[PDB]
Amino acid sequence: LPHFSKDDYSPESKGFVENSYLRGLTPQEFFFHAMGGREGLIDTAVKTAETGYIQRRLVKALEDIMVHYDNTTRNSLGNVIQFIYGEDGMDAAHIEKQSLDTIGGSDAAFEKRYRVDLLNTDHTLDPSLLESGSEILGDLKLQVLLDEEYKQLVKDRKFLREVFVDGEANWPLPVNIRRIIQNAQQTFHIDHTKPSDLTIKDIVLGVKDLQENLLVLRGKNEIIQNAQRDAVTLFCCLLRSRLATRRVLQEYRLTKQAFDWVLSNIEAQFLRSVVHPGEM
Amino acid sequence: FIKRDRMRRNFLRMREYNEFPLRAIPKEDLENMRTHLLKFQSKKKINPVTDFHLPVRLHRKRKTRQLKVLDENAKKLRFEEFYPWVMEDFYNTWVGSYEAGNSDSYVLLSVEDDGSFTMIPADKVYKFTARNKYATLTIDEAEKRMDK
Amino acid sequence: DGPTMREITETIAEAKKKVLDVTKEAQANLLTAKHGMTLRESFEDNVVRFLNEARD
Amino acid sequence: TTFTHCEIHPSMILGVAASIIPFPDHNQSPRNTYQSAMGKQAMGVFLTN
Amino acid sequence: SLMSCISVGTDPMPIITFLSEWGMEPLEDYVPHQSPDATRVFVNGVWHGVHRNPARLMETLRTLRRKGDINPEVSMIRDIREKELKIFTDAGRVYRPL
Amino acid sequence: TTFRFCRDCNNMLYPREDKENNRLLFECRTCSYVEEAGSPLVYRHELITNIGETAGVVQDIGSDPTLPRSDRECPKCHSRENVFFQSQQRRKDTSMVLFFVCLSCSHIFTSDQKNK
Amino acid sequence: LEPGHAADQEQAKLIRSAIEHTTLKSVTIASEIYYDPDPRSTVIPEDEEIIQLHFSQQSPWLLRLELDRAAMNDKDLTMGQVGERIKQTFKNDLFVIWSEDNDEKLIIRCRVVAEEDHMLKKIENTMLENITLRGVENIERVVMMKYDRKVPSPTGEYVKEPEWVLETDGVNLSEVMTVPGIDPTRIYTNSFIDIMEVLGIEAGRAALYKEVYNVIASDGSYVNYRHMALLVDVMTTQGGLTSVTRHGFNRSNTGALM
Amino acid sequence: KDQDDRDHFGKKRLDLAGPLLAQLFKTLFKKLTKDIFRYMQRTVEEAHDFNMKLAINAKTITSGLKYALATGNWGSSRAGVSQVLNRYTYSS
Amino acid sequence: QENERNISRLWRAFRTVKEMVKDRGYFITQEEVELPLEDFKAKYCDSMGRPQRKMMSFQANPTEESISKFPDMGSLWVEFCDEPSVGVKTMKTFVIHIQEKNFQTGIFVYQNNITPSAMKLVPSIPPATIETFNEAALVVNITHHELVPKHIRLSSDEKRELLKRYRLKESQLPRIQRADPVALYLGLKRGEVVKIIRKSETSGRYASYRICM
Numbered sequence A: 001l002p003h004f005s006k007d008d009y010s011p012e013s014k015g016f017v018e019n020s021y022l023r024g025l026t027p028q029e030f031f032f033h034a035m036g037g038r039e040g041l042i043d044t045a046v047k048t049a050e051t052g053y054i055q056r057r058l059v060k061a062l063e064d065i066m067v068h069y070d071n072t073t074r075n076s077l078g079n080v081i082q083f084i085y086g087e088d089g090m091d092a093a094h095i096e097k098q099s100l101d102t103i104g105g106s107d108a109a110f111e112k113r114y115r116v117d118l119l120n121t122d123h124t125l126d127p128s129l130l131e132s133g134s135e136i137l138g139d140l141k142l143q144v145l146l147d148e149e150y151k152q153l154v155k156d157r158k159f160l161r162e163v164f165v166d167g168e169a170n171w172p173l174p175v176n177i178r179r180i181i182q183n184a185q186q187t188f189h190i191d192h193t194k195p196s197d198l199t200i201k202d203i204v205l206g207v208k209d210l211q212e213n214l215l216v217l218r219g220k221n222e223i224i225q226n227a228q229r230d231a232v233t234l235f236c237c238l239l240r241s242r243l244a245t246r247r248v249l250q251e252y253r254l255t256k257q258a259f260d261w262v263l264s265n266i267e268a269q270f271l272r273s274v275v276h277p278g279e280m
Numbered sequence B: 001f002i003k004r005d006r007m008r009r010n011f012l013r014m015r016e017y018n019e020f021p022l023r024a025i026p027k028e029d030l031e032n033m034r035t036h037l038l039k040f041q042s043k044k045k046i047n048p049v050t051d052f053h054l055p056v057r058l059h060r061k062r063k064t065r066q067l068k069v070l071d072e073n074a075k076k077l078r079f080e081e082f083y084p085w086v087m088e089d090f091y092n093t094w095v096g097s098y099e100a101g102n103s104d105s106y107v108l109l110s111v112e113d114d115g116s117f118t119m120i121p122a123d124k125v126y127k128f129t130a131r132n133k134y135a136t137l138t139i140d141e142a143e144k145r146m147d148k
Numbered sequence C: 001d002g003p004t005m006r007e008i009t010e011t012i013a014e015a016k017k018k019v020l021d022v023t024k025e026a027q028a029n030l031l032t033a034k035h036g037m038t039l040r041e042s043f044e045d046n047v048v049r050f051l052n053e054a055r056d
Numbered sequence D: 001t002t003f004t005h006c007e008i009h010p011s012m013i014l015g016v017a018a019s020i021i022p023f024p025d026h027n028q029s030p031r032n033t034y035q036s037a038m039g040k041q042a043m044g045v046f047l048t049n
Numbered sequence E: 001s002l003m004s005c006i007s008v009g010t011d012p013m014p015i016i017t018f019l020s021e022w023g024m025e026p027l028e029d030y031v032p033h034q035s036p037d038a039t040r041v042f043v044n045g046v047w048h049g050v051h052r053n054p055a056r057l058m059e060t061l062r063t064l065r066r067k068g069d070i071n072p073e074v075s076m077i078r079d080i081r082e083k084e085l086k087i088f089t090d091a092g093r094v095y096r097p098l
Numbered sequence F: 001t002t003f004r005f006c007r008d009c010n011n012m013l014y015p016r017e018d019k020e021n022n023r024l025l026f027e028c029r030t031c032s033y034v035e036e037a038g039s040p041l042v043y044r045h046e047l048i049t050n051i052g053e054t055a056g057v058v059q060d061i062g063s064d065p066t067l068p069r070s071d072r073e074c075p076k077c078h079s080r081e082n083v084f085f086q087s088q089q090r091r092k093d094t095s096m097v098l099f100f101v102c103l104s105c106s107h108i109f110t111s112d113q114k115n116k
Numbered sequence G: 001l002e003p004g005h006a007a008d009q010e011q012a013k014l015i016r017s018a019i020e021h022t023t024l025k026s027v028t029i030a031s032e033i034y035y036d037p038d039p040r041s042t043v044i045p046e047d048e049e050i051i052q053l054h055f056s057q058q059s060p061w062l063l064r065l066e067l068d069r070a071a072m073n074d075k076d077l078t079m080g081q082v083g084e085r086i087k088q089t090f091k092n093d094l095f096v097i098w099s100e101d102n103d104e105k106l107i108i109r110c111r112v113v114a115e116e117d118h119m120l121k122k123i124e125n126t127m128l129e130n131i132t133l134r135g136v137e138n139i140e141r142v143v144m145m146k147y148d149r150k151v152p153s154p155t156g157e158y159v160k161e162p163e164w165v166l167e168t169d170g171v172n173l174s175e176v177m178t179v180p181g182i183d184p185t186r187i188y189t190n191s192f193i194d195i196m197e198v199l200g201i202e203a204g205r206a207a208l209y210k211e212v213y214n215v216i217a218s219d220g221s222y223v224n225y226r227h228m229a230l231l232v233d234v235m236t237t238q239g240g241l242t243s244v245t246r247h248g249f250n251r252s253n254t255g256a257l258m
Numbered sequence H: 001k002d003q004d005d006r007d008h009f010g011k012k013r014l015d016l017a018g019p020l021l022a023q024l025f026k027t028l029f030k031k032l033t034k035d036i037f038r039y040m041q042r043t044v045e046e047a048h049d050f051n052m053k054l055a056i057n058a059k060t061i062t063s064g065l066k067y068a069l070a071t072g073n074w075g076s077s078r079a080g081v082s083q084v085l086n087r088y089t090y091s092s
Numbered sequence I: 001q002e003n004e005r006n007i008s009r010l011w012r013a014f015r016t017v018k019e020m021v022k023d024r025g026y027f028i029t030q031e032e033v034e035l036p037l038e039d040f041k042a043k044y045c046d047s048m049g050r051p052q053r054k055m056m057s058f059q060a061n062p063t064e065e066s067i068s069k070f071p072d073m074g075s076l077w078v079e080f081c082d083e084p085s086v087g088v089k090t091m092k093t094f095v096i097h098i099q100e101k102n103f104q105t106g107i108f109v110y111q112n113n114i115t116p117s118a119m120k121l122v123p124s125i126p127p128a129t130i131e132t133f134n135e136a137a138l139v140v141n142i143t144h145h146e147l148v149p150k151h152i153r154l155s156s157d158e159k160r161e162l163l164k165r166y167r168l169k170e171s172q173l174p175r176i177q178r179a180d181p182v183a184l185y186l187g188l189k190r191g192e193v194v195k196i197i198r199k200s201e202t203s204g205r206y207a208s209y210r211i212c213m
């Protein structure tokens, strides 16, 4: 602006503004502030008209892609786009960020939260937490079961350390387990400082059986069943991660009543959260 | 911090040397005669046509009704005089074109035999240019060659 | 607070200082843009940062 | 130094529409632009006759 | 703006006339090589000619406008940098008072 | 660059190597006129520029309205009034350094220090 | 970079040169064409010691041009290899004599075995124009940049490991991936088309995901992984990327009235 | 020197009503010049009687402007130049 | 130096190749694949320093298990070229060298290109087919990149199985193109379908299928 000499790059010349809307603007400043204020408006105007048009196009592209009654995603013609919808066949609305408590932290803490020992002593389960605990100590039919599952969670860690390569420990997932735990606690009053009435065999098997009933896919063909293992592959990895025996016993301290009502629920809500078919 | 107007109440209240004579040349000779001004572009110091070459030869080188466009006479006359003026030998050659920029306000002081002078208006000026001196011309000979 | 207005002005000041300082550094021919951007463009990022951060 | 002109008054860089905004120097420019459009369909009394 | 009007322009003849009688040598006679620093003089995009001392020339033009002799619509720019003097008498330009 | 023009033709004097004398001439490709080679150079490209950065400098330079001001002396006159501006090479990547001009003797002097 | 030589600055610098396009003209100062009648003794005084100490039949049109120290240092080079290139570029026909690294005046000249001066002009052009001196085509401003890469600590946690990253502008995916010292398994390109043609549709699709999820992430909002993942899997169903345009899918046999 | 900005406001001009009517008038005046000439040509070419009112069709202009105001059509070749005035409120 | 730069680039390319045919199914011991640069030099660089592409090419035979799933898979030869551009007559030796040996298919690895006419000589021995590769492209095993999920051929029988489990025609599958590298890396053919194990974040594992067009 001519009210200045040339080569004057000074902040106030090139268009700083160092008052604030309270104490008014000085002609040069005011003019300047018009400049940017318009620039937004132009941008707003176009950035809509590009958006409105753009968005319209994508509508016609993905115009009729539907989920047919096999959880596979093909246009009118039938050209299969996605073999399992969204790659895991869960509807959108029933997702929540939840935490993958097997992938963060150290092995040390990992063990510490998970590693249960009966023959030896190192991470000895304290028998008080449940009835059988006293005579459990040093048994063998069970100790193996620990070694079995605890192996698996590690095989879930190598698995997940890979899958997410940056150790992100939160993801969208179907049914929020966390609340299911809490509802339980606050519907049978986990009266702490007590032995519970759940056996190690109560825990692991009922879980095993649980996983077998999150039927995303209904077939019986080694094709269909394959996807099933690879549908819930993650959502299981969480579930086991949560319901590690120690955790359930040591912290959540469920009863029989709590535990079955829980599992029966996780089934139910999951089945809701299945992507519906016929949804465009 | 207000708006005040009646200050009309205030404002109406606050209110050696050598002579060399001249002569406008007789007019009859002008009436019969046309003279004009030569200019050259030779960049030669004087280029006196005396030392140019001889000889010198300077010269220019029933139905129904209809609509005629309209022009002023001097333009038609001068347009008609499109034949460029050419002085020759039979050896070098000179041609020029009209300039129309500086023919208006121009009177000449003929240094007569006397120290006096006469004043003579300017009719035309021309700009003769030497040409064909190194005599290369390829009218369509380099033209068709050009497209290469 | 009438006082904290003072400090705003101080923060305004340091900027201009932080702005004026930089400027001569370029005119002294004594500026290095790091590898990738010209003298002037680096001069810009040098400045405009100083302004936004000061305002902020 | 070498001033050769002084503005008559800077508030004379506004259109008809703008100089009806009070304190157009305290607002956020697009507001003004919005205001500019709006009076033109403010009702009033357009012409006394 | 409030304080804007438009040049409804005029004839440029009297203007040219002035510079003619005022040292604006005709163009045709321009010989640059020997007159390196002539200031070009334009009118309405018509480069009429050149000049050797524009400084006085300019101010003379100013007063001659401010006298009201030249019409005030006339806008005269002296690009001191480019030895170019520009002048416009055009109908359709936009100007304001200072 | 810096190439002569014919005489009595005034046309550009192109290089013509003399093979006999083992040297270069310069001719009017319009006429006969030719002339020898006075500088063993022929051409040059000179990609870089630090030329002209003082354009517009006139002994009438101060009369400009809007070059702002300072006080440094003439490195010759010791005359401490002068006016400044920036590199006339209004190229992109040019540096900022400021060109000053004495107003006693128009003495040019810039403001960079790394090389005078 | 190489995972061993990851966050290793020198290594980063060692590659840093290796890929940045370096044309001849990018660095040369000024070129003067000339006349030295003698094929042996150079007209200008100075170059002679560079003649004999090379000279310890030819054309006289002695082309001269100059390098800057700094940029010849910025892209650290020597002018032997340059000519060795230049010689191998043409032949052993153009006799190229280079001032040495010890020389303050980085000057290099040549001569050849109508008017030769004009080919030289053609000749000196290509030299400046199309002779890269090193670094891949189309690639300039090998811009360093430091990042954190959450590696697992040897303990079980992650830690924000710092490291050096080679930014760039231009894309020659093919060559760069083949450069020694880099890590090909993890090469990411701003434009995905290359990726497809270089790494096949499934990478491209995956790369396309990367490219979309950025845009939303840049903004700040979040959209379910479902949706973009669905869209991305439309375009690449026909095999090979597909625009979403007139020419994208209306060029598919997908119902007329649609 | 830099590339010219084509938007520096000084390089603009505002063809206000005056110059705009000129365009409209000037061209429309041609349509007069041609026509009389045409009729003039005919009457002689057939020795008819030279009458003025047939010779000049006045509508040629009056109809031209009145239309070309009434709609911003300006020939076609241009529109958006004439509006109804906006008498909402004084400032409008 | 540049020869030395070459040698690695050859060394790499060789190593890459081993893996290629290691993945169509053939029998190549892990260590063999992974001889360091040094051995490569002594084994195939001559005395002075040149490597012999002529005695560095070789034959392949599927692992028996490869044979097990696909009865057709036959021995396989691979060839490089010493000509930095490939004469027809030179590859005339090749195809008939195949024909004598009768590999079921065989794969050429030029360094720049071939006399165009010889590619006319290529699709010439049905059933036995030829695969041709820039040495240069083979420098980096694109498969090894992050974004290359696994792929596998299928027994037609498996592919046969698939549709009848989803009730599909071959046509409305998602596709790849024979042009696409991963095809070329696998040597795909019209209608060869590919299970693509993909490590997909919303289920950990997602698998897809394309049909080589």
Ligand SMILES: [Zn+2]
Binding pocket: F006, F007, F008, F009, F010, F011, F028, F029, F030, F031, F032, F033
């Ligand atoms: Zn000549």
Ligand SMILES: [Zn+2]
Binding pocket: F074, F075, F076, F077, F078, F079, F102, F103, F104, F105, F106, F107
């Ligand atoms: Zn001085």
